[PDB]
Amino acid sequence: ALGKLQDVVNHNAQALNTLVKQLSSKFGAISSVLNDIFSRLDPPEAEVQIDRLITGRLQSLQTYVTQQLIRAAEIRASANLAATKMSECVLGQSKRVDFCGKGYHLMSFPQSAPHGVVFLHVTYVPAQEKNFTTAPAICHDGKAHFPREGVFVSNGTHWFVTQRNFYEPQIITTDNTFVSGNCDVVIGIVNNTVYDP
Amino acid sequence: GTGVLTESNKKFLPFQQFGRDIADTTDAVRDPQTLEILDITPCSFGGVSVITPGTNTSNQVAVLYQGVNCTEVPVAIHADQLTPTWRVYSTGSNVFQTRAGCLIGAEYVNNSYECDIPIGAGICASYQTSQSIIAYTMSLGAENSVAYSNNSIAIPTNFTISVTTEILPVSMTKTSVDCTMYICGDSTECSNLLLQYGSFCTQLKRALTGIAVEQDKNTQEVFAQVKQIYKTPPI
Amino acid sequence: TMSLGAENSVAYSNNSIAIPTNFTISVTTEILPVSMTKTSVDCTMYICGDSTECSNLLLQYGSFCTQLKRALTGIAVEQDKNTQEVFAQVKQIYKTPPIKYFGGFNFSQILPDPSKPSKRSPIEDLLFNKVTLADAGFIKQYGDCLGDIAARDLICAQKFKGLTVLPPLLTDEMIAQYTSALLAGTITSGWTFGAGPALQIPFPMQMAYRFNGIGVTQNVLYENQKLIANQFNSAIGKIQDSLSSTPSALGKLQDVVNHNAQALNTLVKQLSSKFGAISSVLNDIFSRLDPPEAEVQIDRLITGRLQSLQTYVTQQLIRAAEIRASANLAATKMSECVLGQSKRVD
Amino acid sequence: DLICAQKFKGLTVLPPLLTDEMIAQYTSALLAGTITSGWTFGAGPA
Ligand SMILES: *[C@@H]1O[C@H](CO)[C@@H](O)[C@H](O)[C@H]1NC(C)=O
Ligand SMILES: *[C@@H]1O[C@H](CO)[C@@H](O)[C@H](O)[C@H]1NC(C)=O
Ligand SMILES: *[C@@H]1O[C@H](CO)[C@@H](O)[C@H](O)[C@H]1NC(C)=O
Ligand SMILES: *[C@@H]1O[C@H](CO)[C@@H](O)[C@H](O)[C@H]1NC(C)=O
Ligand SMILES: *[C@@H]1O[C@H](CO)[C@@H](O)[C@H](O)[C@H]1NC(C)=O
Ligand SMILES: *[C@@H]1O[C@H](CO)[C@@H](O)[C@H](O)[C@H]1NC(C)=O
């Protein structure tokens, strides 16, 4: 579950552990303790031994710092992503798919984890389907009849105009249905009535 | 140098003896005592890679030899050629060749399952049944044929309310290093020699301070988007 | 001097509105890199050319080499993650229905082709052929590398130096199957399958709802169905022609491949630098010097080559971060665009 | 702990400016507003 923060912590700890362990490395030099080098060699050669050791250790610090720069850049990308997620989904309702949850989005709740943030995207998912016979327009009186908002479906014999994301049939009336043109150009136009209130 | 010697079909000009390549390594040589032009090629090699279920579960294991074909891999027994002390695998009967390299220790299965130990080029091993390591091409999923028709729609009559977590990192630990004490602790001569390298320690110090303040800004701009703290109502 | 463009004088008038009276569908491509090539470097065959004393001397340089290997492994697994999260969003591989009459729209250019042994649509075949990819994980038995070959010389030299590439986990056929599942679902179901399984819906109805989602009612779709079908078909054919004509259409992917090839090949050239040593061959250094000076030169050369490898790794890390940003962008595009309809301009 | 050991050799770990109680208070404010106000409190008041 929490792998995406556990890895942050473990990578930081591992980098520091490697940086510490580098102290024992010799880098070709006779030993990795400077006092022994000073108290066992003459200054001219103690000089070069220390030179090599300093170069190695400084280069180790340098690579540590560069790796940290790159990790910080990637974490800043994730922090910009988290800021956008909190703004767009905690403080609103997002309209872009798969940004704030698999499915249609309703809300979101933040929870503060150590070195991170956790969101609880409360989404909406349709479950149970039922096939139907659908027709783009209904030619009542020669004129076509597009559904004002919804799809045309037929439970076999009768036609209803339901919404698209939750089956809920209503009888056809002039308020579900707007008209534009005539039933001579569109294909799949059908013949039905449109009750007038 | 070491390697394998080959009858080079190439022709040297009468005065230069040996060739080279992109890197200045020798890639040919005119053999003395025979005046024959000889090639050089490194003895075959390649990384190995171990495929193990967790030790808490099993102790048997399959080994992947990357790149190499399944011809020289068994020939290379540990006694002479195979450097690692892996003698049983150099003789196993379960040798199977994939596009990643010759692998030893798994039985190829003609089935297909969603897998856990990726190998490469589709293959991926696992543990199954009298129970050992398999090696099978992965399965993308249950190949479905969604029914298209030009007068049939499918309208959902029932919903559900998922709630799915999503975990994002925000900040990291704000380390900081002490250049001189790290490189050499309490050695004045070493400090003298160390200051001679210029603005390295200052540069590291500056970079790490930049990272730390960036962390503080990260947390501040992820969470502190609220004008004033609010209270939940009593009821 | 650079011309920004043809000067124009848009006309303002507080009782003048220009309402268009005719549209024009248009299909326009958009290339994106997703995954780079998974390299993996052998520390002690590059740094320490097939020698014995040098390797022992390397054994006292700390954990630089295991750290390098660990970083490159992280990059490789990251690349497989990128590909898997961009393409394999669909849980269950759908497949196209036998009939291909989608109200008049012609998908033959994008839907798969049963004739070819490579089960890819013709457009995928075109751009595929166009991208000149260097070898990425053949079997390369010792035999194919041994010889006086000419074109394989580059990969052979890289392998000889120990530098090598690893095959991507998902073969190109599995990638093709993933893209075909995305296509079949988005054709016969629409955006509906981004919120669960795929709900079937006749394609003219789906285009009617796409239309209705940009402020134009649906009658300008149902009343002009054949005209829009012809515009769509022509547009797709044009795309095919335009891709075929200019080889620079997809220069981004070629840029990725070439950047990797250059980056790794510089590495092979680096070995021809003495670094202030006697020569660039360890064996000669060991075979002409006494241990004291020999070791000193060896240390000088090992530090040089380790520094070169460190630079290579670092730049690989940078480039992998850029590719991961592009792959996150492509994952967001395949979500908000392929699996839905986007309201974000441009 | 190992932290003391790595503390020597001069590798300090500075604390984060925001303590976990402060961060928890931030998220508590967010939750209370988003529960009794909705989206309204991203735009000006609550
Ligand atoms: C809808 O038709 C398809 C066509 O085969 C069928 O598989 C499916 O079961 C039908 N829907 C229901 C709810 O039965
Ligand atoms: C369809 O809906 C109508 C609504 O009046 C209902 O009377 C009828 O029983 C339903 N089923 C069929 C098969 O017509
Ligand atoms: C629909 O009705 C019209 C007249 O009302 C008739 O001319 C036409 O043939 C009918 N078509 C169908 C498909 O019922
Ligand atoms: C070395 O011995 C071979 C034996 O056949 C002979 O051909 C060759 O000339 C000899 N080389 C020299 C330099 O004498
Ligand atoms: C492995 O070597 C054999 C040698 O006869 C060759 O036939 C075979 O094709 C090689 N493997 C592959 C995958 O090419
Ligand atoms: C649906 O598809 C069938 C088979 O291609 C076709 O005969 C029919 O005309 C289509 N729908 C219409 C327009 O009636």
Ligand SMILES: *[C@@H]1O[C@H](CO)[C@@H](O)[C@H](O)[C@H]1NC(C)=O
């Ligand atoms: C809809 O689904 C719920 C479970 O999600 C179930 O309890 C209920 O009976 C189903 N039918 C209706 C009409 O709600």
Ligand SMILES: *[C@@H]1O[C@H](CO)[C@@H](O)[C@H](O)[C@H]1NC(C)=O
């Ligand atoms: C719209 O433009 C197209 C050009 O492709 C033309 O063929 C068509 O007749 C135009 N329609 C109208 C109503 O002007």
Ligand SMILES: *[C@@H]1O[C@H](CO)[C@@H](O)[C@H](O)[C@H]1NC(C)=O
């Ligand atoms: C679709 O385009 C292809 C390529 O030209 C060809 O089969 C034909 O022109 C069209 N066929 C159908 C059925 O649309």
